[PDB]
Design a protein around this ligand. Structure first.
Ligand code: GDP
Ligand code: CA
Length: 306
């Protein structure tokens, strides 16, 4: 069994994320670009493109009206089903607050789930400087997304203001937001690709991610003294995420290391997760020994059940 992973960008922000991921290089993942904006879709690098709402917009964006994105997606339902068909997992990514993302992304998520895919949303909330109407349409979209998906990761754009200095280029800040999706996707590809010593597979991802609500995905890398504890802390850190580790009741944790990976280190990492949660966590634990590695340890966490 080799699970089919698809990433679907919906609207401007969603498609920017897809474009920056394709640009960065990513294999065994199919990308789908969905938009009302024909100008933007023409410049997309995605292998499969769906223009929605040509009747409604005549190839322009939806102009900040979420009912137009919704109706656009509904009328292109069969084209969307066809593009998804055969996926085992779908990541739907979108910026909430606009017309197309806000309205179309939950429809896409709903179609994905009813095609049988494990469906994860990764969405942004607008910057506060964008104003209250934007924030309020965004919140309606987030609730709609939450209803449609299996699990939802929310990245408030205001959090980007916590990781920049006064000169950090906007595109560099956006790339940091993109990493949440990219590394979440990559960590699932990696789990599926490798047969670990204590193996985790797609059915374990399904157990943790299916019909939950909020989620956290994370990866942390470290080496040398305290590598396991530091990799675990990095894995659970959530500066850009609305949903932190606290209150997590289920965690999929994988530790990858060289032949030096110690049992003691494995427990240290697991206990960082347990203790940061402040709940009695139901852990799905895995380990991979990759003899090509020297002193590096990688800890992967997916946490749900808040
Ligand atoms: N982090 C991030 N946020 C974005 C990006 N593009 C747009 N946004 C945000 O997403 C919201 C909706 O924008 P957009 O997706 O272009 O609207 P739509 O195409 O009408 O859905 C904006 O109000 C911004 O908060 C991006 O590339 N990165
Ligand atoms: Ca595996």
């Amino acid at each position: 069994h080799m699970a089919t992973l698809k990433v679907i960008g919906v609207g401007g922000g969603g498609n920017n994320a897809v474009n920056r991921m394709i640009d960065h290089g990513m294999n065994n993942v199919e990308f789908i670009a969905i938009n009302t904006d024909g100008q933007a879709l023409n410049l997309s690098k995605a292998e499969s493109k769906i223009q929605i709402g040509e009747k409604l917009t005549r190839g322009l964006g939806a102009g900040a009206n979420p009912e137009i994105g919704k109706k656009a997606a509904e009328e292109s339902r069969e084209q969307i089903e066809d593009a998804i068909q055969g996926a085992d997992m779908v990541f739907v990514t979108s910026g909430m607050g606009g017309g197309t993302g806000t309205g179309a992304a939950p429809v896409v998520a709903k179609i994905a789930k009813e095609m049988g895919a494990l469906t994860v949303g990764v969405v942004t909330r607008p910057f506060s400087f964008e104003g209250r109407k934007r924030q309020t349409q965004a919140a309606a979209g987030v609730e709609a997304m939450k209803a449609a998906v299996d699990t939802l990761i929310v990245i408030p754009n205001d959090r980007l203001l916590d990781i920049v200095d006064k000169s950090t280029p906007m595109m560099e800040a956006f790339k940091e937001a993109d990493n949440v999706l990219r590394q979440g996707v990559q960590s699932i590809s990696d789990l599926i690709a490798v047969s670990g010593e204590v193996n985790l597979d797609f059915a374990d991802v399904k157990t943790i991610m299916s019909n939950q609500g909020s989620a956290l995905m994370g990866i942390g890398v470290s080496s040398g003294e305290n590598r396991a504890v530091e990799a675990a802390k990095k894995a659970i850190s959530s500066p850009l995420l609305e949903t932190s580790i606290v209150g997590a009741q289920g965690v999929l944790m994988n530790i990858t290391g060289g032949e030096s990976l110690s049992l003691f280190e494995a427990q240290e990492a697991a206990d960082i997760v347990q203790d940061a949660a402040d709940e009695d966590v139901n852990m799905i634990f895995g380990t991979v020994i990759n003899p090509e590695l020297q002193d590096e340890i990688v800890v992967t966490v997916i946490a749900t059940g808040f």
